[PDB]
Short mmCIF file of all heavy atoms in Angstrom, two decimals:
data_model
loop_
_atom_site.label_atom_id
_atom_site.label_comp_id
_atom_site.label_asym_id
_atom_site.label_seq_id
_atom_site.Cartn_x
_atom_site.Cartn_y
_atom_site.Cartn_z
N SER A 17 136.59 193.41 37.25
CA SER A 17 136.07 192.55 36.28
C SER A 17 135.58 191.31 36.72
O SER A 17 134.69 190.76 36.00
CB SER A 17 137.24 192.35 35.20
OG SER A 17 137.61 193.50 34.54
N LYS A 18 136.09 190.74 37.91
CA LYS A 18 135.54 189.54 38.48
C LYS A 18 134.26 189.73 39.24
O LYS A 18 133.52 188.92 39.63
CB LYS A 18 136.57 189.01 39.38
CG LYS A 18 137.71 188.32 38.69
CD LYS A 18 138.78 187.84 39.64
CE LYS A 18 139.98 187.09 38.95
NZ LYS A 18 141.04 186.93 39.90
N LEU A 19 133.84 191.01 39.55
CA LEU A 19 132.59 191.39 40.22
C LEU A 19 131.42 191.29 39.30
O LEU A 19 131.38 191.84 38.26
CB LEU A 19 132.73 192.73 40.93
CG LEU A 19 133.87 192.88 42.02
CD1 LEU A 19 133.89 194.45 42.48
CD2 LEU A 19 133.67 191.98 43.20
N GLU A 20 130.44 190.68 39.81
CA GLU A 20 129.10 190.44 39.07
C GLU A 20 128.25 191.55 38.65
O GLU A 20 127.58 191.72 37.63
CB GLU A 20 128.31 189.29 39.64
CG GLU A 20 129.04 187.84 39.60
CD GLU A 20 129.34 187.55 38.23
OE1 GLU A 20 128.46 187.49 37.32
OE2 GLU A 20 130.48 187.18 37.92
N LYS A 21 128.37 192.64 39.60
CA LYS A 21 127.52 193.86 39.44
C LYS A 21 128.15 194.70 38.23
O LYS A 21 127.38 195.55 37.65
CB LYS A 21 127.59 194.73 40.74
CG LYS A 21 128.97 195.14 41.13
CD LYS A 21 128.80 196.17 42.42
CE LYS A 21 130.27 196.42 42.98
NZ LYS A 21 130.15 197.43 44.01
N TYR A 22 129.38 194.32 37.70
CA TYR A 22 129.95 195.05 36.60
C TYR A 22 129.93 194.18 35.32
O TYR A 22 130.63 194.34 34.40
CB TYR A 22 131.30 195.53 37.05
CG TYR A 22 131.37 196.55 38.09
CD1 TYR A 22 132.34 196.41 39.14
CD2 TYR A 22 130.63 197.63 38.05
CE1 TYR A 22 132.48 197.30 40.10
CE2 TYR A 22 130.49 198.65 39.08
CZ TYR A 22 131.55 198.47 40.19
OH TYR A 22 131.52 199.32 41.25
N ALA A 23 129.08 193.13 35.34
CA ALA A 23 129.00 192.17 34.17
C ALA A 23 128.65 192.88 32.84
O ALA A 23 129.29 192.54 31.80
CB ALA A 23 128.16 191.01 34.58
N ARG A 24 127.89 193.84 32.92
CA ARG A 24 127.29 194.61 31.70
C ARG A 24 128.44 195.31 31.03
O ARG A 24 128.53 195.38 29.75
CB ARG A 24 126.13 195.52 31.94
CG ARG A 24 126.37 196.59 33.06
CD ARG A 24 124.98 197.16 33.51
NE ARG A 24 125.07 198.49 33.99
CZ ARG A 24 125.36 198.89 35.21
NH1 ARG A 24 125.59 198.03 36.14
NH2 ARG A 24 125.49 200.21 35.56
N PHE A 25 129.46 195.73 31.82
CA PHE A 25 130.56 196.52 31.28
C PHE A 25 131.58 195.62 30.51
O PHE A 25 132.08 195.88 29.44
CB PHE A 25 131.18 197.43 32.26
CG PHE A 25 130.25 198.31 32.81
CD1 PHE A 25 129.82 198.16 34.11
CD2 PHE A 25 129.77 199.54 32.09
CE1 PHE A 25 128.82 199.12 34.79
CE2 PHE A 25 128.84 200.32 32.64
CZ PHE A 25 128.37 200.23 33.96
N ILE A 26 131.82 194.46 31.21
CA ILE A 26 132.62 193.37 30.54
C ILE A 26 131.92 192.91 29.33
O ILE A 26 132.54 192.70 28.34
CB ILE A 26 132.88 192.31 31.61
CG1 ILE A 26 133.53 192.83 32.93
CG2 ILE A 26 133.91 191.15 30.95
CD1 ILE A 26 134.75 193.73 32.79
N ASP A 27 130.60 192.60 29.31
CA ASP A 27 129.85 192.10 28.21
C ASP A 27 130.00 193.12 26.99
O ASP A 27 130.28 192.75 25.80
CB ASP A 27 128.46 191.84 28.55
CG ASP A 27 128.19 190.73 29.37
OD1 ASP A 27 129.03 189.81 29.45
OD2 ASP A 27 127.09 190.63 30.00
N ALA A 28 129.84 194.39 27.17
CA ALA A 28 130.04 195.37 26.40
C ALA A 28 131.46 195.41 25.65
O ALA A 28 131.59 195.60 24.44
CB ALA A 28 129.74 196.84 26.91
N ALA A 29 132.41 195.18 26.42
CA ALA A 29 133.84 195.17 26.12
C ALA A 29 134.12 193.96 25.10
O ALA A 29 134.76 193.97 24.20
CB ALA A 29 134.80 195.25 27.24
N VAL A 30 133.52 192.78 25.65
CA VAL A 30 133.63 191.58 24.86
C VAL A 30 132.98 191.69 23.55
O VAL A 30 133.50 191.21 22.52
CB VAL A 30 133.09 190.40 25.70
CG1 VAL A 30 132.99 189.06 24.87
CG2 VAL A 30 134.01 190.08 26.82
N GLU A 31 131.77 192.26 23.52
CA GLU A 31 131.05 192.47 22.17
C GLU A 31 131.84 193.32 21.32
O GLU A 31 132.07 193.19 20.05
CB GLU A 31 129.68 193.03 22.40
CG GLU A 31 128.92 193.53 21.20
CD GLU A 31 127.63 194.24 21.52
OE1 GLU A 31 127.33 194.69 22.61
OE2 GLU A 31 126.80 194.08 20.47
N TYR A 32 132.52 194.41 21.99
CA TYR A 32 133.43 195.41 21.10
C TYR A 32 134.59 194.60 20.56
O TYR A 32 134.88 194.79 19.41
CB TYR A 32 133.87 196.54 22.16
CG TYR A 32 134.82 197.39 21.51
CD1 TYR A 32 134.20 198.61 20.93
CD2 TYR A 32 136.14 197.31 21.50
CE1 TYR A 32 135.02 199.57 20.40
CE2 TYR A 32 136.94 198.27 20.86
CZ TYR A 32 136.41 199.30 20.30
OH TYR A 32 137.10 200.35 19.68
N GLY A 33 135.19 193.82 21.50
CA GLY A 33 136.42 193.01 20.89
C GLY A 33 135.95 192.13 19.78
O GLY A 33 136.74 191.97 18.77
N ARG A 34 134.87 191.46 19.89
CA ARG A 34 134.41 190.46 18.88
C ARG A 34 134.18 191.23 17.59
O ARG A 34 134.43 190.59 16.58
CB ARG A 34 133.07 189.80 19.42
CG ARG A 34 132.62 188.53 18.61
CD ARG A 34 131.62 187.79 19.39
NE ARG A 34 130.95 186.84 18.52
CZ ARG A 34 129.70 186.33 18.69
NH1 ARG A 34 129.07 186.81 19.85
NH2 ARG A 34 129.17 185.47 17.96
N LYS A 35 133.68 192.39 17.64
CA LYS A 35 133.39 193.16 16.45
C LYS A 35 134.76 193.70 15.75
O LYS A 35 134.74 193.66 14.54
CB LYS A 35 132.49 194.43 16.77
CG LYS A 35 132.39 195.45 15.65
CD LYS A 35 131.41 196.58 15.91
CE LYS A 35 131.73 197.19 17.43
NZ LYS A 35 131.48 198.76 17.51
N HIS A 36 135.73 194.09 16.46
CA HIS A 36 137.00 194.61 15.81
C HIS A 36 138.07 193.64 15.50
O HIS A 36 138.84 193.99 14.79
CB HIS A 36 137.32 195.69 16.70
CG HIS A 36 136.43 196.97 16.61
ND1 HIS A 36 135.51 197.23 17.57
CD2 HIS A 36 136.37 197.92 15.69
CE1 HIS A 36 134.96 198.34 17.30
NE2 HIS A 36 135.33 198.84 16.06
N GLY A 37 138.19 192.54 16.34
CA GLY A 37 139.17 191.50 16.13
C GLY A 37 138.79 190.46 14.96
O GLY A 37 137.58 190.21 14.92
N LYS A 38 139.82 189.95 14.51
CA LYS A 38 139.61 188.90 13.51
C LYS A 38 139.95 187.67 14.18
O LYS A 38 139.08 186.65 14.29
CB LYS A 38 140.50 189.06 12.29
CG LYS A 38 140.31 188.04 11.16
CD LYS A 38 138.83 187.94 10.55
CE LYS A 38 138.73 186.97 9.46
NZ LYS A 38 139.56 187.49 8.22
N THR A 39 141.21 187.36 14.59
CA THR A 39 141.60 186.16 15.38
C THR A 39 141.02 186.31 16.81
O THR A 39 140.74 187.54 17.15
CB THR A 39 143.15 186.01 15.47
OG1 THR A 39 143.80 187.19 16.11
CG2 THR A 39 143.82 186.03 14.14
N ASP A 40 140.89 185.28 17.44
CA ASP A 40 140.52 185.27 18.84
C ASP A 40 141.27 186.28 19.75
O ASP A 40 140.91 186.91 20.55
CB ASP A 40 140.26 183.87 19.43
CG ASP A 40 139.05 183.08 18.99
OD1 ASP A 40 138.10 183.75 18.45
OD2 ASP A 40 139.00 181.86 19.17
N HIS A 41 142.68 186.08 19.40
CA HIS A 41 143.76 186.84 20.01
C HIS A 41 143.43 188.31 19.95
O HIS A 41 143.37 189.10 20.92
CB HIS A 41 145.09 186.58 19.56
CG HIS A 41 146.20 187.37 20.27
ND1 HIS A 41 146.54 187.06 21.61
CD2 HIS A 41 146.91 188.36 19.84
CE1 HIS A 41 147.51 187.89 21.91
NE2 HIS A 41 147.73 188.77 20.92
N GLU A 42 143.08 188.88 18.70
CA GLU A 42 142.78 190.21 18.35
C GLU A 42 141.55 190.58 19.20
O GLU A 42 141.39 191.70 19.66
CB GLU A 42 142.59 190.45 16.84
CG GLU A 42 143.96 190.56 16.16
CD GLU A 42 143.70 190.52 14.63
OE1 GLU A 42 142.64 190.11 14.20
OE2 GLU A 42 144.68 191.02 13.86
N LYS A 43 140.45 189.80 19.07
CA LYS A 43 139.19 190.03 19.80
C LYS A 43 139.37 190.23 21.36
O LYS A 43 138.90 191.20 21.87
CB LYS A 43 138.18 188.83 19.52
CG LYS A 43 137.81 188.69 18.04
CD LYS A 43 136.89 187.59 17.91
CE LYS A 43 136.22 187.61 16.40
NZ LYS A 43 135.59 186.36 16.17
N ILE A 44 140.21 189.25 21.81
CA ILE A 44 140.48 189.39 23.45
C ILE A 44 141.25 190.71 23.63
O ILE A 44 140.94 191.46 24.58
CB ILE A 44 141.37 188.13 23.89
CG1 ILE A 44 140.34 186.86 23.68
CG2 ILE A 44 141.82 188.27 25.32
CD1 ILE A 44 141.24 185.54 23.73
N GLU A 45 142.29 190.95 22.83
CA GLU A 45 143.22 192.10 23.12
C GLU A 45 142.30 193.39 23.03
O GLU A 45 142.45 194.33 23.80
CB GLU A 45 144.31 192.22 22.25
CG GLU A 45 145.40 191.17 22.58
CD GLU A 45 146.34 191.38 23.83
OE1 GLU A 45 146.32 192.53 24.30
OE2 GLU A 45 146.89 190.41 24.42
N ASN A 46 141.41 193.51 21.97
CA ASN A 46 140.47 194.71 21.77
C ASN A 46 139.51 194.92 23.03
O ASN A 46 139.19 195.92 23.36
CB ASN A 46 139.71 194.60 20.49
CG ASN A 46 140.56 195.04 19.23
OD1 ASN A 46 140.88 196.22 19.26
ND2 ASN A 46 140.77 194.17 18.29
N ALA A 47 139.05 193.66 23.49
CA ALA A 47 138.07 193.60 24.55
C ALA A 47 138.79 194.16 25.95
O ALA A 47 138.25 194.98 26.68
CB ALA A 47 137.47 192.29 24.79
N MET A 48 140.19 193.87 26.11
CA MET A 48 140.91 194.22 27.18
C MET A 48 140.95 195.91 27.15
O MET A 48 140.74 196.59 28.24
CB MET A 48 142.29 193.65 27.12
CG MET A 48 142.22 192.04 27.15
SD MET A 48 143.89 191.30 27.31
CE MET A 48 143.77 191.51 29.00
N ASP A 49 141.32 196.37 25.96
CA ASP A 49 141.39 197.85 25.89
C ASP A 49 140.13 198.48 26.19
O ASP A 49 140.04 199.43 27.05
CB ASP A 49 141.65 198.26 24.47
CG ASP A 49 143.05 197.80 23.92
OD1 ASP A 49 144.11 197.48 24.74
OD2 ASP A 49 143.13 197.77 22.68
N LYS A 50 139.03 197.99 25.75
CA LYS A 50 137.67 198.51 25.98
C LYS A 50 137.23 198.47 27.44
O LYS A 50 136.54 199.19 27.86
CB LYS A 50 136.65 197.74 24.98
CG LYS A 50 135.29 198.41 25.01
CD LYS A 50 135.20 199.95 24.51
CE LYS A 50 133.92 200.45 24.22
NZ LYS A 50 133.85 202.09 24.34
N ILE A 51 137.64 197.34 28.17
CA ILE A 51 137.35 197.14 29.47
C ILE A 51 137.90 198.33 30.30
O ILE A 51 137.39 198.83 31.10
CB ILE A 51 138.00 195.83 30.16
CG1 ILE A 51 136.98 194.68 29.69
CG2 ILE A 51 138.14 195.82 31.65
CD1 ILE A 51 137.49 193.22 30.19
N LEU A 52 139.29 198.59 29.95
CA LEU A 52 139.79 199.72 30.59
C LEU A 52 139.12 201.04 30.44
O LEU A 52 138.93 201.84 31.38
CB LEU A 52 141.31 199.97 30.19
CG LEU A 52 142.36 198.83 30.20
CD1 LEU A 52 143.79 199.39 29.97
CD2 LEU A 52 142.41 198.12 31.63
N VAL A 53 138.71 201.37 29.11
CA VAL A 53 137.96 202.46 28.68
C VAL A 53 136.59 202.57 29.34
O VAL A 53 135.99 203.65 29.80
CB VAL A 53 138.09 202.67 27.27
CG1 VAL A 53 137.13 203.76 26.78
CG2 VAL A 53 139.52 203.06 26.84
N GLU A 54 135.97 201.44 29.46
CA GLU A 54 134.54 201.20 30.09
C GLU A 54 134.52 201.67 31.45
O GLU A 54 133.82 202.48 31.81
CB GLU A 54 134.03 199.82 29.86
CG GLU A 54 133.42 199.60 28.47
CD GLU A 54 132.01 199.97 28.16
OE1 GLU A 54 131.24 200.30 29.18
OE2 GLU A 54 131.75 200.23 26.96
N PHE A 55 135.44 201.15 32.30
CA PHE A 55 135.55 201.49 33.62
C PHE A 55 135.98 202.92 33.83
O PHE A 55 135.35 203.60 34.63
CB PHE A 55 136.60 200.49 34.32
CG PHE A 55 136.01 199.31 34.83
CD1 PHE A 55 136.24 198.13 34.04
CD2 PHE A 55 135.25 199.23 36.00
CE1 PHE A 55 135.63 196.86 34.52
CE2 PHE A 55 134.63 197.96 36.37
CZ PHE A 55 134.87 196.85 35.56
N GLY A 56 136.99 203.42 33.11
CA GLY A 56 137.35 204.82 33.18
C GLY A 56 136.27 205.82 32.76
O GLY A 56 136.14 206.81 33.36
N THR A 57 135.56 205.43 31.69
CA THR A 57 134.28 206.29 31.38
C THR A 57 133.27 206.30 32.52
O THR A 57 132.70 207.34 32.78
CB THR A 57 133.74 205.77 30.08
OG1 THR A 57 134.61 205.82 28.95
CG2 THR A 57 132.49 206.67 29.70
N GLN A 58 132.98 205.29 33.13
CA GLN A 58 132.04 205.19 34.26
C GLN A 58 132.68 206.04 35.55
O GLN A 58 131.80 206.80 36.24
CB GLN A 58 131.71 203.84 34.71
CG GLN A 58 131.07 203.01 33.59
CD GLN A 58 129.74 203.79 33.11
OE1 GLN A 58 128.89 204.20 33.85
NE2 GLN A 58 129.54 203.73 31.77
N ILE A 59 133.91 205.87 35.82
CA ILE A 59 134.60 206.63 36.90
C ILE A 59 134.53 208.15 36.69
O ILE A 59 134.23 208.79 37.63
CB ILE A 59 136.06 206.13 36.97
CG1 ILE A 59 136.25 204.68 37.66
CG2 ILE A 59 136.92 207.13 37.74
CD1 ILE A 59 137.62 204.07 37.36
N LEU A 60 134.61 208.59 35.40
CA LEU A 60 134.53 210.01 35.12
C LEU A 60 133.35 210.57 35.35
O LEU A 60 133.10 211.84 35.46
CB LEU A 60 135.15 210.21 33.77
CG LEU A 60 136.61 210.01 33.56
CD1 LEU A 60 137.01 210.24 32.15
CD2 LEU A 60 137.58 211.12 34.48
N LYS A 61 132.11 209.85 35.45
CA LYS A 61 130.83 210.30 35.85
C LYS A 61 130.86 210.59 37.33
O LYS A 61 129.94 211.38 37.73
CB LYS A 61 129.69 209.29 35.23
CG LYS A 61 129.58 209.28 33.87
CD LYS A 61 128.57 208.08 33.50
CE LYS A 61 128.74 207.57 32.12
NZ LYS A 61 127.57 206.70 31.80
#
């Protein structure tokens, strides 16, 4: 997640969290879930 070449996947996850969460806490927690799934999805290709 700290690597710059994977910035687009973190951005996608953050956008996802922002959409699904109400509190900032919920947004961050949802983004974390999506980060895991984003990386996993790419790995499976």
Side-chain angles (χ1 to χ4, degrees):
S17 299
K18 288 175 178 170
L19 298 176
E20 289 307 302
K21 62 176 177 178
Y22 300 131
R24 62 194 205 271
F25 302 106
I26 308 304
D27 289 339
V30 168
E31 176 183 19
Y32 181 90
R34 193 167 166 203
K35 170 175 51 149
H36 290 96
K38 181 67 171 292
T39 63
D40 283 341
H41 181 72
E42 287 173 339
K43 291 175 170 169
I44 293 157
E45 290 285 340
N46 278 296
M48 305 189 83
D49 292 338
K50 191 57 170 161
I51 284 176
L52 301 194
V53 169
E54 283 280 335
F55 276 99
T57 301
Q58 299 305 316
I59 285 162
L60 289 173
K61 295 175 197 185

